[PDB]
């Protein structure tokens, strides 16, 4: 996998963030997660982790998988980093992401966010506390 520019335009919510990339608007899923919504709990501090961590990045990336770019509702589906730091595998770090929707063919980085995932749940970390 290649990473590719992109530039923030707006944190939405935990998986979600509108990029500028190719020059056009796009929205983002993260692959491989799923955050609470906005309403739940662990929601808003998911969101707020992504927010920081991609507002105060200098370089944001996109980087696709092999399968679909696009979801059914026109989503870009990629891994995105911060920095050179996955936003997906950190959201997963520190409990406030599951690992989820894994497809196949979609899923370069699935053993990595396990392995994220195994250590937050160890150290009971937000949604495993
Ligand atoms: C992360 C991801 C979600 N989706 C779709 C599946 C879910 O469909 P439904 O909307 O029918 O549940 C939805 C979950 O996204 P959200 O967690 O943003 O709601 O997005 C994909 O199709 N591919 C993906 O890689
Ligand atoms: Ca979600």
Redesign the pocket.
């Known amino acids: 996998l290649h990473k590719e520019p992109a530039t923030l335009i707006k944190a939405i919510d935990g ?2 963030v509108k990029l500028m990339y190719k020059g056009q608007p796009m929205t983002f ?7 609470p ?1 906005f309403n739940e709990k662990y929601g808003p501090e998911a969101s707020a982790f992504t927010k920081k961590m991609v507002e105060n990045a200098k370089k944001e990336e996109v980087e696709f998988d092999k399968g ?1 770019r696009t ?3 026109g ?1 870009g ?1 990629a891994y995105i980093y911060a920095d050179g730091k996955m936003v997906n595998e950190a959201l997963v770090r520190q409990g406030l992401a599951k690992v ?2 894994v ?1 196949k063919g ?1 899923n370069t980085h699935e053993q990595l966010l396990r392995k994220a995932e195994a250590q937050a749940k160890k150290e009971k970390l937000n949604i495993w506390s």
């Open positions: 998986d979600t899923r993260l692959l491989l997660v799923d955050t919504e679909q979801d059914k509702y989503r589906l989820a929707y497809y979609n």
